[PDB]
Write a protein that binds this ligand. Structure first.
Ligand SMILES: [Mg+2]
Ligand SMILES: [Sr+2]
Length: 119
RNA sequence: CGAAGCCCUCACGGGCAAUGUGGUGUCAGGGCUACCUCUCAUCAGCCGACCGUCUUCACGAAGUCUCUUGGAAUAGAGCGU
């Protein structure tokens, strides 16, 4: 809410979570806010995911401003448990990162482009 | 480093845990990279006392002889242990 500056449509989110499921089974992904933050800093992040229902908002608060000064694209997910299932976890995840995509590189590229147009 | 983890249950199974269980590390700073050497430190865990002290208990030597006084010798005098 405080870190959210744009509303991502349900259709764009469906595409994004589908792309994340094939990103773990082919390439590699990072699960958890700590591992997402280190990826943006180490530069090894292609597309970063962040949940909208994070209480407290502090945990994830930094991701939008950090990704902007590191050129890493980001997208918002409405629910926390859906991002966890998409990353391949029984639990939820406040944030996930795609560390080098796999057979989804063409999809991720377009998702990164659809978000830039949405400001 | 990143689920490699913890709890309940005989098990089955359940619960916890990416908002981080668990590994590493804690100023002889540590970590990462590159090598040298090596450990007996530390932490976890097993076993598990002596002595001493306090209390309680068992065992444990040698006269109940003489005379006088006395209601009564545990007294006096005598002899003995
Ligand atoms: Mg430790
Ligand atoms: Sr949760």
């Amino acid at each position: 809410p405080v870190y959210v500056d744009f509303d991502v449509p349900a259709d764009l989110e469906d595409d994004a979570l589908e792309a994340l499921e094939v990103a773990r089974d082919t390439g590699a992904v990072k699960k958890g806010t700590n591992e997402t933050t280190k990826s943006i800093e180490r530069g090894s992040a292609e597309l970063v995911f962040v949940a909208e229902d994070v209480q407290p908002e502090e945990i994830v608060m930094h991701i939008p401003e950090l990704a902007d000064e590191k050129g890493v694209p980001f997208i918002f997910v409405e629910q926390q448990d859906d991002l966890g299932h998409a990353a391949g976890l029984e639990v939820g995840s406040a944030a996930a990162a795609v560390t080098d995509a796999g057979e989804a590189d063409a999809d991720v590229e377009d998702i990164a482009d659809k978000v830039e147009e949405l400001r």
